[PDB]
Amino acid sequence: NKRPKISLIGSGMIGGTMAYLCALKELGDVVLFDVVKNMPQGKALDLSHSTSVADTNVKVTGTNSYEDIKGSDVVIITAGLTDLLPINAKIMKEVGENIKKYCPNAFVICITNPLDVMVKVLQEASGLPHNKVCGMAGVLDSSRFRYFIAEKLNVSPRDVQAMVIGAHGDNMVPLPRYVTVNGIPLQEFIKKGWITQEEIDEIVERTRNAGGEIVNLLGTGSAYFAPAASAIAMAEAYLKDQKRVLPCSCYLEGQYGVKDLYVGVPVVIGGNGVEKVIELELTPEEKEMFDKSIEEVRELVKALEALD
Amino acid sequence: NKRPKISLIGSGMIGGTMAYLCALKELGDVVLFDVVKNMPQGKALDLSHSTSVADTNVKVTGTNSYEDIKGSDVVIITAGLTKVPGDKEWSRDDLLPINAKIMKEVGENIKKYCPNAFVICITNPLDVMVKVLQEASGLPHNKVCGMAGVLDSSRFRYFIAEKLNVSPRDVQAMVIGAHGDNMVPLPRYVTVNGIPLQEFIKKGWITQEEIDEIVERTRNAGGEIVNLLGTGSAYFAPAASAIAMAEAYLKDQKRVLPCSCYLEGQYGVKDLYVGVPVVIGGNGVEKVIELELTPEEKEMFDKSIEEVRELVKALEAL
Amino acid sequence: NKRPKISLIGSGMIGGTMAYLCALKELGDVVLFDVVKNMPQGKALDLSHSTSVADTNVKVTGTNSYEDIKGSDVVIITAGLTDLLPINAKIMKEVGENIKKYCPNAFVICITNPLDVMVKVLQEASGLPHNKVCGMAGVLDSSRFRYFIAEKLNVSPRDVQAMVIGAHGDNMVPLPRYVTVNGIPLQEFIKKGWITQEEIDEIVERTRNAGGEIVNLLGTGSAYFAPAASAIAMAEAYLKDQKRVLPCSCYLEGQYGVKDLYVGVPVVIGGNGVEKVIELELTPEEKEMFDKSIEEVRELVKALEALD
Amino acid sequence: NKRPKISLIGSGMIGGTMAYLCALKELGDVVLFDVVKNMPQGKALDLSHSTSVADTNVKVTGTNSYEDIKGSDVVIITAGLTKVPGDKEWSRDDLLPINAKIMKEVGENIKKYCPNAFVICITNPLDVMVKVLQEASGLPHNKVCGMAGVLDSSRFRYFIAEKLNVSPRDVQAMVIGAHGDNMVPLPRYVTVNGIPLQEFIKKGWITQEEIDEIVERTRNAGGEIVNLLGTGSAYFAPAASAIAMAEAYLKDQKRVLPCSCYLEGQYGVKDLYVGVPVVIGGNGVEKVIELELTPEEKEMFDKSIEEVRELVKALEAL
Missing domain, CATH: 3.90.110.10 (Lactate dehydrogenase/glycoside hydrolase, family 4, C-terminal)
Structure with missing residues (x-):
C-alpha cells in the first residue's frame, strides 16, 4: 500500500512552489529533482520542516538522480532555460527517456517553454500514451x-x-x-x-x-x-x-x-x-x-x- | 477583538449540520437555539467534542433563550413547520400561518439583540417568510435574504x-x-x-x-x-x-x-x-x-x- | 485507475455524518449501505447535491445490497441496535462474512456497541488480518x-x-x-x-x-x-x-x-x-x-x- | 464591514511565501511592501492570478509606500539584512546596526498608519529587533512578538x-x-x-x-x-x-x-x-x-x- 508519488523535474521557482502546494494539500510524497547539486535537497529540508507547521506527514525529498522518480504517479517538468530551443529539446529528450525507464505509468505535465513544442518532444522521447502527457499553459x-x-x-x-x-x-x-x-x-x-x-x-x-x-x-x-x-x-x-x-x-x-x-x-x-x-x-x-x-x-x- | 458570531435559530438536522460546517470551517463562534429544552445543548456538546478531532478552537453553544444571539454577525433560521406532512390543507392553514407568526417573534428578537446581523432564512414558504422576517425585524432589505x-x-x-x-x-x-x-x-x-x-x-x-x-x-x-x-x-x-x-x-x-x-x-x-x-x-x-x-x-x-x-x-x- | 472507495455499513446518524465528512474531504467515493430500503439512497442524493456546493466530484451512492461494497478501501460499521448483544453479534457476523467475500483487502473500522466485543466478532467472521480490523472509541x-x-x-x-x-x-x-x-x-x-x-x-x-x-x-x-x-x-x-x-x-x-x-x-x-x-x-x-x-x-x- | 488586512513588510522569498499562504487560506487582504521598485507589484500580480486557480476573492497588492499599510490587522516584517553573508564581522557592524535602524522606521510607520495591528517580526537578531520595533512603535508589548x-x-x-x-x-x-x-x-x-x-x-x-x-x-x-x-x-x-x-x-x-x-x-x-x-x-x-x-x-x-x-x-x- 503506497502513497501517491509526485516528482518535480526541476526544483526552481515554479518547481519548489509546486512542492509546497503538494505538501499543503497532502497530495502525495514529493520528489524534487534538479541537475544543480544540493539545491533541491535544501529546498526539501525547508519544506519538510513546513509540514510540522501544517501538521502533516508529507514526505518531501530532494535529489540529483533520476532513479528517484521510479513509480511516480505524476511528473511535472520545469527543467530548462527561460539557441534556447535545441537546448531545451535536448533536455526534454533526456527527461522523456528517464521517464520511460523509471516511471512509464506516470501522468506527465510539461511547463518548459516553448510549451506546446516541448510537450510533443517529451511525448516522443517518452513513448507514453498521448493521453497521459500534457502541458500546462x-x-x-x-x-x-x-x-x-x-x-x-x-x-x-x-x-x-x-x-x-x-x-x-x-x-x-x-x-x-x-x-x-x-x-x-x-x-x-x-x-x-x-x-x-x-x-x-x-x-x-x-x-x-x-x-x-x-x-x-x-x-x-x-x-x-x-x-x-x-x-x-x-x-x-x-x-x-x-x-x-x-x-x-x-x-x-x-x-x-x-x-x-x-x-x-x-x-x-x-x-x-x-x-x-x-x-x-x-x-x-x-x-x-x-x-x-x-x-x-x-x-x-x-x-x-x-x-534528430 | 472578537470572533464572528453565527446564531442558528432552530437546531434540527439542518441547523446541526450548519453548526458542524461552521465548526469544520472555523467560520466563527456558533449559537444553537431551539425551543426543545436541552436538545440544542446536547448537540453543542457533541460538536464541541468534534472540534478536538478537527483541532479547532471553535466555540459551539446551545441555548433555549434568544438573549444569547446578542451580537450575531450572521443568523440562519430553520425554525417552523416543514413541507413533510404535505395533507393538502397543511400548506394553507398550518405552514403559512404558523411560520409567519414564528418569523415575527424571530424578527423581533433579532431587532432587539443583533440588528446588525446578516439574516439568512430557510423556513418555508421561503420567499414569503423572508418578507415577514424582514418587516418584523426592520433590518435593511439587503441584510436579510433567503436560501433556496x-x-x-x-x-x-x-x-x-x-x-x-x-x-x-x-x-x-x-x-x-x-x-x-x-x-x-x-x-x-x-x-x-x-x-x-x-x-x-x-x-x-x-x-x-x-x-x-x-x-x-x-x-x-x-x-x-x-x-x-x-x-x-x-x-x-x-x-x-x-x-x-x-x-x-x-x-x-x-x-x-x-x-x-x-x-x-x-x-x-x-x-x-x-x-x-x-x-x-x-x-x-x-x-x-x-x-x-x-x-x-x-x-x-x-x-x-x-x-x-x-x-x-x-x-x-x- | 481508481478513486478510493469508502463503504459505510449503516446509514444512520453517525453513518450519514461520516459520508458528509468523506465528501467534504474528497477522501473517496462513498457507499452508504443500510438494511432499511430507500433511506440510504435518499441520504446519498442529498449528499450528492451537497457536492455542487462544495465544488467537488465525489460520488456518493446509497444501497441496500452488500454487493456494492466490493473493492472498498475502507469500511466503517455502525449497523446495529443501541438481548442486544446476541442480536448485534448476529449482524456483525453477517457484516464480517459479506466483507470477506466482497472486499477482503479493506481496512475495517467498527463502531457498533459493545465496541471492543463486537470488533473481535467482526474480525473472526471476516478473517482479515488483525492489523486491518479495528474499532473506534x-x-x-x-x-x-x-x-x-x-x-x-x-x-x-x-x-x-x-x-x-x-x-x-x-x-x-x-x-x-x-x-x-x-x-x-x-x-x-x-x-x-x-x-x-x-x-x-x-x-x-x-x-x-x-x-x-x-x-x-x-x-x-x-x-x-x-x-x-x-x-x-x-x-x-x-x-x-x-x-x-x-x-x-x-x-x-x-x-x-x-x-x-x-x-x-x-x-x-x-x-x-x-x-x-x-x-x-x-x-x-x-x-x-x-x-x-x-x-x-x-x-x-x-x-x-x-x-457459536 | 471589512476583510482582515495583512501587510508584509519585505517582499523577498519569505514575504511572497507568506502572501501565498494568506491567499490560499483566505485569511484576508494582503499588502506586499518592499523598497525594490515594481517587484512587490509583480509578485502581487502573480499571486492575484493564482486566486483564480484557488477560486478565492483575495485581494493582493504590491506597493513601495508605507501609506498602504493603513489599518493592517497584522503586520509581518522580513525587511533587512540576512545571516547569509556570515564574514565574521557581518553580524556586528552590518546586521545588528543596519537592521535596528530599519526596525525604527518600520516601527514609526506602524505607529502612524496601523497602531492597532498585531506585529510579527522575523528580521534577525530577532529577539533584539523585536525590542527595537516595539520601542520605536510604542505599541503594547503583547501586540508585538517575534517568530523563531x-x-x-x-x-x-x-x-x-x-x-x-x-x-x-x-x-x-x-x-x-x-x-x-x-x-x-x-x-x-x-x-x-x-x-x-x-x-x-x-x-x-x-x-x-x-x-x-x-x-x-x-x-x-x-x-x-x-x-x-x-x-x-x-x-x-x-x-x-x-x-x-x-x-x-x-x-x-x-x-x-x-x-x-x-x-x-x-x-x-x-x-x-x-x-x-x-x-x-x-x-x-x-x-x-x-x-x-x-x-x-x-x-x-x-x-x-x-x-x-x-x-x-x-x-x-x-
Missing part, C-alpha cells in the same frame, strides 16, 4: 483572463468562466465570446454597464502579454505562484479523478483541424489523464486566430524532427 | 454534471424565482466552463429531453428525497447552501448566487422578495443581476412571483 | 477528555494531548497522568493555578459518562458529530498514510497483558493499518483499572464464542 | 517525527530562548501525544544520542539549509511559522506556540523579549507559560537571554 492564461475580468466586475474569480486556447505565447487566443459570469454571457454585463467592450479588448491583450508584464515588474525572473497553482490543479484533477474542464496543451488527432500536435484546447482531466477533448464551436474568426497561433508550433515541431 | 436558489441550483448543477461526467464545479446552472414547484430553472444559461450547454447537445454529450427531465427532477428534488427517506427531509445540501451564503458574507467573497432577495423594480418586481442571481459580499446582498430573460422565461418568472404575491396577500389579511 | 473518548481539559485551560484542543484506554464504556480509563499541553505535563498547570486537582478528577469522570450526558440532553438518540469525526480521522490516517498516534480498539497479542482480544490502546494508524501498538508505562494503579475495564470484554467474548 | 520558536520547534518536531516514523502532528517539541546558536531546545518536554519521549527510548524507537544529535541539528538547521541551497535561505517553514502565529491571532485560536515575547519577571527575565511558550489569541500574546525548568535547563536559558542582553546593550549605545 491554458490554465495559467485562463486564470489571468479570469482574474482581470473578475477585478473589473468586482465578483469572485470563482464565478468567472474564461478560456485561452492555442499556443502559449503572445499569440495565445483569449475567447471573450465564451466568457461568462456563473454562465451568464459577459455581453449581458456590457448592456448593463458593468464593463465596456473596449475594456474587454484591453483585458484580452493584457492576458496575451501578462507573462511579460510580470517579468518586467519582477525585474529578475518570471511568474511562478500562478504557474505552479495551475500545474497543481491539473495534477490534483488527475490524482483525485475530479473530471475538471481545463484548457491544457494536449495531443490532437483531428479536432480543431490539427493532427499529431500538442495545442492548447479545453479538456477533461480525470484519473485516466486527458479523458476528453472538447471541440468548441469556434467562429471563422476564432478558428483563424487559432490556426495562426499554432503555425509557429507546427513549424518548430517539424524543424526539430528534422534535426 | 443555491440549493435548487446545487441540484440542477449536480444532475447536469452527472450526465456529462464532469465536475459539478464547471457546471454553471441557475434556478430563479420562488422556491417550490413554481421555481424556474434556466437550461438556456447552463454552461460547462462558459461553453453553452447547447454545444454538448450537438456533440452528443446530452439530449434536450434529458435536459428537460433534469429541469423537472430539479423542481421535484426535495419530494424525491423525502419519499426515499421515509422520515424527514434533506438537510446536507440545504445546510451547505446556507453556509456558502453565510461564508460569502463573512469573508466578502462577492460570490454570484441565486438567493431570495428584495427586488425594487428589477425584473418588473416591486417591493417583494424573490429568487434572483445576486452578488453576496461583506455588506450583504450588494447587487441584483438583471438577466436578459427571454419572454418565455420572464413569463415563467412572473407566474412564479404571482404565487408568491398571493400568499403574502393571504397572510397580510389576518 | 478511544479517539472519541479522547476528544472529549481533550475538549473538557482545553475548555478549563482556555487553550485550543489541538494543543491538549489526552488519552483514554481500555474498553468503551463507563469503565473506560482516562489517563490524567499523560495529559499534556504541547508536551508540558498538566501537573505544571496545577502548580500555576490554571486548573485544580479536583477539576481534573471531575473531568475524568465526566469523560467516562460523556455519552450518557449527551444522550440525556439529546432526549432522542446519542452523539454522532464527534463519533463520526473520530472514525473519519482514523480512516483519513489509513488512506493518506498519516501515521497518526491514536487510541483505538486493536488486536493485542501480549501487550498490556492481553492476548486474543481487541482493547482500547494507543496505536499508529498508517497505510498498512494498525502499524504499531504503543505500550504505555502504566503505573500499577493504571494497569489495574485497565484490567478491570477489559474484564467485561474478556467474558463476553468468551460467552459469545460458546454460543 | 515556531520555526525552530517545527524543525525539532520534524527530525523527531522522522526517526520515530510518526506524524509531526503528534510530536510536541519546543525550542525556547533566543533564536540562533543560543536557542535552547527541550528534549525533556518532547512527547508523542503526551507520552514522554523517554518511553520510546526504552522501547527502542529512539536512542538518546540520536536525540542529542537532533537537538544539535535543530540548532544548526538554518545553516544546514543555506549551505545546501548555495543561494539564499530557507523560506517555506519560516513563512508557515509566521502565518500560523498570524492565524492564531486572526482567528483567536489560543494556540500554544514558542514565540519571542516580552517578559516582565517570568523566568527571571525583566523587560526583555525572548522565546517562551505562550498562548496566542485574538488579543495577541495573551499568556506567558512559565515552565518548571530544571536548573540545567534554566542555566541554558539564562545564558541565552544574556547574549540577547549584550546585543541590545551594544545597540542602545549608539
Whole structure:
C-alpha cells in the first residue's frame, strides 16, 4: 500500500512552489529533482520542516538522480532555460527517456517553454500514451483572463468562466465570446454597464502579454505562484479523478483541424489523464486566430524532427 | 477583538449540520437555539467534542433563550413547520400561518439583540417568510435574504454534471424565482466552463429531453428525497447552501448566487422578495443581476412571483 | 485507475455524518449501505447535491445490497441496535462474512456497541488480518477528555494531548497522568493555578459518562458529530498514510497483558493499518483499572464464542 | 464591514511565501511592501492570478509606500539584512546596526498608519529587533512578538517525527530562548501525544544520542539549509511559522506556540523579549507559560537571554 508519488523535474521557482502546494494539500510524497547539486535537497529540508507547521506527514525529498522518480504517479517538468530551443529539446529528450525507464505509468505535465513544442518532444522521447502527457499553459492564461475580468466586475474569480486556447505565447487566443459570469454571457454585463467592450479588448491583450508584464515588474525572473497553482490543479484533477474542464496543451488527432500536435484546447482531466477533448464551436474568426497561433508550433515541431 | 458570531435559530438536522460546517470551517463562534429544552445543548456538546478531532478552537453553544444571539454577525433560521406532512390543507392553514407568526417573534428578537446581523432564512414558504422576517425585524432589505436558489441550483448543477461526467464545479446552472414547484430553472444559461450547454447537445454529450427531465427532477428534488427517506427531509445540501451564503458574507467573497432577495423594480418586481442571481459580499446582498430573460422565461418568472404575491396577500389579511 | 472507495455499513446518524465528512474531504467515493430500503439512497442524493456546493466530484451512492461494497478501501460499521448483544453479534457476523467475500483487502473500522466485543466478532467472521480490523472509541473518548481539559485551560484542543484506554464504556480509563499541553505535563498547570486537582478528577469522570450526558440532553438518540469525526480521522490516517498516534480498539497479542482480544490502546494508524501498538508505562494503579475495564470484554467474548 | 488586512513588510522569498499562504487560506487582504521598485507589484500580480486557480476573492497588492499599510490587522516584517553573508564581522557592524535602524522606521510607520495591528517580526537578531520595533512603535508589548520558536520547534518536531516514523502532528517539541546558536531546545518536554519521549527510548524507537544529535541539528538547521541551497535561505517553514502565529491571532485560536515575547519577571527575565511558550489569541500574546525548568535547563536559558542582553546593550549605545 503506497502513497501517491509526485516528482518535480526541476526544483526552481515554479518547481519548489509546486512542492509546497503538494505538501499543503497532502497530495502525495514529493520528489524534487534538479541537475544543480544540493539545491533541491535544501529546498526539501525547508519544506519538510513546513509540514510540522501544517501538521502533516508529507514526505518531501530532494535529489540529483533520476532513479528517484521510479513509480511516480505524476511528473511535472520545469527543467530548462527561460539557441534556447535545441537546448531545451535536448533536455526534454533526456527527461522523456528517464521517464520511460523509471516511471512509464506516470501522468506527465510539461511547463518548459516553448510549451506546446516541448510537450510533443517529451511525448516522443517518452513513448507514453498521448493521453497521459500534457502541458500546462491554458490554465495559467485562463486564470489571468479570469482574474482581470473578475477585478473589473468586482465578483469572485470563482464565478468567472474564461478560456485561452492555442499556443502559449503572445499569440495565445483569449475567447471573450465564451466568457461568462456563473454562465451568464459577459455581453449581458456590457448592456448593463458593468464593463465596456473596449475594456474587454484591453483585458484580452493584457492576458496575451501578462507573462511579460510580470517579468518586467519582477525585474529578475518570471511568474511562478500562478504557474505552479495551475500545474497543481491539473495534477490534483488527475490524482483525485475530479473530471475538471481545463484548457491544457494536449495531443490532437483531428479536432480543431490539427493532427499529431500538442495545442492548447479545453479538456477533461480525470484519473485516466486527458479523458476528453472538447471541440468548441469556434467562429471563422476564432478558428483563424487559432490556426495562426499554432503555425509557429507546427513549424518548430517539424524543424526539430528534422534535426534528430 | 472578537470572533464572528453565527446564531442558528432552530437546531434540527439542518441547523446541526450548519453548526458542524461552521465548526469544520472555523467560520466563527456558533449559537444553537431551539425551543426543545436541552436538545440544542446536547448537540453543542457533541460538536464541541468534534472540534478536538478537527483541532479547532471553535466555540459551539446551545441555548433555549434568544438573549444569547446578542451580537450575531450572521443568523440562519430553520425554525417552523416543514413541507413533510404535505395533507393538502397543511400548506394553507398550518405552514403559512404558523411560520409567519414564528418569523415575527424571530424578527423581533433579532431587532432587539443583533440588528446588525446578516439574516439568512430557510423556513418555508421561503420567499414569503423572508418578507415577514424582514418587516418584523426592520433590518435593511439587503441584510436579510433567503436560501433556496443555491440549493435548487446545487441540484440542477449536480444532475447536469452527472450526465456529462464532469465536475459539478464547471457546471454553471441557475434556478430563479420562488422556491417550490413554481421555481424556474434556466437550461438556456447552463454552461460547462462558459461553453453553452447547447454545444454538448450537438456533440452528443446530452439530449434536450434529458435536459428537460433534469429541469423537472430539479423542481421535484426535495419530494424525491423525502419519499426515499421515509422520515424527514434533506438537510446536507440545504445546510451547505446556507453556509456558502453565510461564508460569502463573512469573508466578502462577492460570490454570484441565486438567493431570495428584495427586488425594487428589477425584473418588473416591486417591493417583494424573490429568487434572483445576486452578488453576496461583506455588506450583504450588494447587487441584483438583471438577466436578459427571454419572454418565455420572464413569463415563467412572473407566474412564479404571482404565487408568491398571493400568499403574502393571504397572510397580510389576518 | 481508481478513486478510493469508502463503504459505510449503516446509514444512520453517525453513518450519514461520516459520508458528509468523506465528501467534504474528497477522501473517496462513498457507499452508504443500510438494511432499511430507500433511506440510504435518499441520504446519498442529498449528499450528492451537497457536492455542487462544495465544488467537488465525489460520488456518493446509497444501497441496500452488500454487493456494492466490493473493492472498498475502507469500511466503517455502525449497523446495529443501541438481548442486544446476541442480536448485534448476529449482524456483525453477517457484516464480517459479506466483507470477506466482497472486499477482503479493506481496512475495517467498527463502531457498533459493545465496541471492543463486537470488533473481535467482526474480525473472526471476516478473517482479515488483525492489523486491518479495528474499532473506534478511544479517539472519541479522547476528544472529549481533550475538549473538557482545553475548555478549563482556555487553550485550543489541538494543543491538549489526552488519552483514554481500555474498553468503551463507563469503565473506560482516562489517563490524567499523560495529559499534556504541547508536551508540558498538566501537573505544571496545577502548580500555576490554571486548573485544580479536583477539576481534573471531575473531568475524568465526566469523560467516562460523556455519552450518557449527551444522550440525556439529546432526549432522542446519542452523539454522532464527534463519533463520526473520530472514525473519519482514523480512516483519513489509513488512506493518506498519516501515521497518526491514536487510541483505538486493536488486536493485542501480549501487550498490556492481553492476548486474543481487541482493547482500547494507543496505536499508529498508517497505510498498512494498525502499524504499531504503543505500550504505555502504566503505573500499577493504571494497569489495574485497565484490567478491570477489559474484564467485561474478556467474558463476553468468551460467552459469545460458546454460543457459536 | 471589512476583510482582515495583512501587510508584509519585505517582499523577498519569505514575504511572497507568506502572501501565498494568506491567499490560499483566505485569511484576508494582503499588502506586499518592499523598497525594490515594481517587484512587490509583480509578485502581487502573480499571486492575484493564482486566486483564480484557488477560486478565492483575495485581494493582493504590491506597493513601495508605507501609506498602504493603513489599518493592517497584522503586520509581518522580513525587511533587512540576512545571516547569509556570515564574514565574521557581518553580524556586528552590518546586521545588528543596519537592521535596528530599519526596525525604527518600520516601527514609526506602524505607529502612524496601523497602531492597532498585531506585529510579527522575523528580521534577525530577532529577539533584539523585536525590542527595537516595539520601542520605536510604542505599541503594547503583547501586540508585538517575534517568530523563531515556531520555526525552530517545527524543525525539532520534524527530525523527531522522522526517526520515530510518526506524524509531526503528534510530536510536541519546543525550542525556547533566543533564536540562533543560543536557542535552547527541550528534549525533556518532547512527547508523542503526551507520552514522554523517554518511553520510546526504552522501547527502542529512539536512542538518546540520536536525540542529542537532533537537538544539535535543530540548532544548526538554518545553516544546514543555506549551505545546501548555495543561494539564499530557507523560506517555506519560516513563512508557515509566521502565518500560523498570524492565524492564531486572526482567528483567536489560543494556540500554544514558542514565540519571542516580552517578559516582565517570568523566568527571571525583566523587560526583555525572548522565546517562551505562550498562548496566542485574538488579543495577541495573551499568556506567558512559565515552565518548571530544571536548573540545567534554566542555566541554558539564562545564558541565552544574556547574549540577547549584550546585543541590545551594544545597540542602545549608539
